[PDB]
Amino acid sequence: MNTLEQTIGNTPLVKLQRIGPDNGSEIWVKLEGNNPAGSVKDRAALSMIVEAEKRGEIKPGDVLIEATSGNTGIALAMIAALKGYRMKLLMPDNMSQERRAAMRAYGAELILVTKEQGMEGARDLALAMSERGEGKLLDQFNNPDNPYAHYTTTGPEIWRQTSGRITHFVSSMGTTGTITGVSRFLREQEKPVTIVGLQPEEGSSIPGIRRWPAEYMPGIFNASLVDEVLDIHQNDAENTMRELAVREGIFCGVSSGGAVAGALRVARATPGAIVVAIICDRGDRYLSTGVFG
Amino acid sequence: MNTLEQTIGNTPLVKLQRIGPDNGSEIWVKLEGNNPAGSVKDRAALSMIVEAEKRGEIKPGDVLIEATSGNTGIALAMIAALKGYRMKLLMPDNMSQERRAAMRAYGAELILVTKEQGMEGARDLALAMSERGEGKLLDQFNNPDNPYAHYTTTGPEIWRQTSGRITHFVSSMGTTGTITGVSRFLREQEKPVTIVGLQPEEGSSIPGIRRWPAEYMPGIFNASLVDEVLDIHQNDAENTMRELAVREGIFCGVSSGGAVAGALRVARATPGAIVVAIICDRGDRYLSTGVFG
Numbered sequence: 001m002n003t004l005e006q007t008i009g010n011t012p013l014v015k016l017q018r019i020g021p022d023n024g025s026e027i028w029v030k031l032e033g034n035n036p037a038g039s040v041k042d043r044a045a046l047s048m049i050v051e052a053e054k055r056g057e058i059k060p061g062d063v064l065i066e067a068t069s070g071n072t073g074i075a076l077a078m079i080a081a082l083k084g085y086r087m088k089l090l091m092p093d094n095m096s097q098e099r100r101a102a103m104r105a106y107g108a109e110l111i112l113v114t115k116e117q118g119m120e121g122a123r124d125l126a127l128a129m130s131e132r133g134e135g136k137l138l139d140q141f142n143n144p145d146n147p148y149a150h151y152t153t154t155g156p157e158i159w160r161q162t163s164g165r166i167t168h169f170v171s172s173m174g175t176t177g178t179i180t181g182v183s184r185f186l187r188e189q190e191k192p193v194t195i196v197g198l199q200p201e202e203g204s205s206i207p208g209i210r211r212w213p214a215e216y217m218p219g220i221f222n223a224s225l226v227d228e229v230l231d232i233h234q235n236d237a238e239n240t241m242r243e244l245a246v247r248e249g250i251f252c253g254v255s256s257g258g259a260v261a262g263a264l265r266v267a268r269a270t271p272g273a274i275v276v277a278i279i280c281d282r283g284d285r286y287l288s289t290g291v292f293g
Numbered sequence: 294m295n296t297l298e299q300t301i302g303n304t305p306l307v308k309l310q311r312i313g314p315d316n317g318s319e320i321w322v323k324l325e326g327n328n329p330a331g332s333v334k335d336r337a338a339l340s341m342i343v344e345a346e347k348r349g350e351i352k353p354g355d356v357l358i359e360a361t362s363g364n365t366g367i368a369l370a371m372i373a374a375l376k377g378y379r380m381k382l383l384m385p386d387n388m389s390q391e392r393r394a395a396m397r398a399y400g401a402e403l404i405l406v407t408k409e410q411g412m413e414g415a416r417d418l419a420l421a422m423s424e425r426g427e428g429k430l431l432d433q434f435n436n437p438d439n440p441y442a443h444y445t446t447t448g449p450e451i452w453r454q455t456s457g458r459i460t461h462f463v464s465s466m467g468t469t470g471t472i473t474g475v476s477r478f479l480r481e482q483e484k485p486v487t488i489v490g491l492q493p494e495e496g497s498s499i500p501g502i503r504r505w506p507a508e509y510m511p512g513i514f515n516a517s518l519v520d521e522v523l524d525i526h527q528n529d530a531e532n533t534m535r536e537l538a539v540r541e542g543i544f545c546g547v548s549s550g551g552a553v554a555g556a557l558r559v560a561r562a563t564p565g566a567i568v569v570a571i572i573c574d575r576g577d578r579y580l581s582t583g584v585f586g
């Protein structure tokens with residue numbers, strides 16, 4: 001159609017010109033910050049909602065519920081404003097103003113729990129509400145429609161954009177929808193492709209992702225779809241993030257620096273590798289946090 | 294050729310779904326925030342530098358100079374990082390720390406003048422430095438390569454995207470490069486097109502543009518290329534800006550709200566008009582100023 005919805009997905013895939021070893025390997029980055037609301041989350045938000053519409057579970061005017069407050073919140077608030085839904089976002093009351101402003105700007109309703117109840121308290125209340133019938137819960141960590149988005153758009157795009165030359169795919173794992181969906185699609189190809197997931201080192205804090213308890217991975221995660229899982233140190237992610245802006249002109253977030261850091265490790269260890277890493281969002285919303293300056 | 298440079302331009306053109314009169318008019322918005330560094334300035338930044346390279350005036354490694362601190366500064370810093378130039382941006386010492394960070398992230402060097410000297414003192418210093426042979430001055434307000442970017446990319450895209458249906462073009466004027474270059478291209482078409490330029494009402498403050506002294510328009514400006522100039526009140530631009538996010542899911546800046554406000558006036562006064570307005574940048578860098586949440 002002719003709406004903002006058609007600008008989601010089909011993000012550019014560009015090759016890094018300067019960082020990276022000179023051993024024949026190539027590093028390409030998928031610019032998810034190009035999505036309308038600035039991040040890879042626009043894909044899963046659209047998919048979770050669109051697929052629910054297709055099942056008759058929801059229709060414009062309905063209330064949507066989710067506990068979150070980062071890109072998923074921004075993305076859901078945007079899809080809600082775009083498609084005509086009432087979005088209710090649950091989060092602890094210690095959110096910066098700017099942080100909640102990104103979600104409120106789209107007209108989403110922010111429902112606060114106590115700092116103490118924290119993110120888990122929010123998850124619970126959101127669930128309480130969906131079971132009472134106060135609105136459809138999206139649940140990004142378990143909703144198969146999340147990876148479905150990447151199985152149908154992101155992965156095919158990457159395969160088409162690298163003309164099937166891709167040998168390694170690198171993704172920082174949050175819900176794991178991106179790595180799960182993209183892997184699912186790549187496995188269907190004859191040519192083998194190594195799937196590399198990244199998680200923060202214990203103690204490291206990288207916005208957008210988290211280190212999952214060994215046996216407490218999100219429901220949509222499928223260990224057999226990931227060939228390797230690497231740890232990325234906060235500092236290493238932040239340095240690569242700043243290096244991307246300075247040496248490539250690519251202004252992205254911390255997890256994106258982490259993804260390229262991982263792609264660098266891979267490229268260095270494998271001459272000739274054709275690595276694709278996901279750049280999750282732009283760096284704009286990180287400016288106030290000082291990671292840049 | 295596969296670098297971030299190829300993601301500049303070719304921005305989406307989407308139709309507003311809810312705001313606007315129901316009189317047969319259509320309002321389309323050109324999403325310039327989709328440019329790699331988030332603003333319409335990426336086009337002129339790339340053009341001024343590419344064209345100077347063609348003329349042999351500069352080559353990678355050289356110093357580039359410009360007095361500015363908004364989107365132009367950010368766009369120039371980004372092109373410089375992308376292409377390998379040493380960017381120097383001049384501005385008075387009263388820039389917020391976030392405003393400075395948007396330019397420094399790309400490795401640009403900021404050269405400060407006193408608040409007393411202000412933007413005009415910076416313009417002067419920049420000119421002096423270039424005359425002392427310290428670097429190539431870009432001069433966004435007088436450089437023909439600024440409107441040229443719009444004559445060759447922006448205008449042609451709009452004409453193609455609307456399949457020649459456009460009847461009115463609305464643009465908030467800063468350097469006037471966009472309205473100038475787009476008008477030049479549209480005038481070459483058989484079908485007439487009304488060119489509408491917008492400027493802030495006296496006393497109104499709209500980031501990115503300014504009310505030019507009657508007989509002191511920027512050098513690149515050509516009065517005959519613009520059919521009408523409307524005044525936009527700051528409040529009206531801010532309101533339309535907020536309403537775009539809420540009712541359309543389009544998150545953009547103040548001048549963009551002013552642009553859609555102008556397009557609404559045009560649409561309301563002319564049933565059946567096919568209006569195209571330029572959305573200059575995303576709203577992200579405006580959150581900290583409070584104009585939204």
Ligand SMILES: *Cc1c(COP(=O)(O)O)cnc(C)c1O
Nearest residue numbers: 071174175176177178208255280
């Ligand atoms: C969601 C997100 C990720 C991880 O993507 P998943 O598909 O959820 O694995 C990484 N970084 C940021 C900033 C994100 O918002």
Ligand SMILES: *Cc1c(COP(=O)(O)O)cnc(C)c1O
Nearest residue numbers: 364467468469470471501548573
């Ligand atoms: C520069 C700018 C404009 C004006 O565009 P011109 O092509 O310079 O007239 C409008 N809004 C914003 C935010 C700008 O950066």
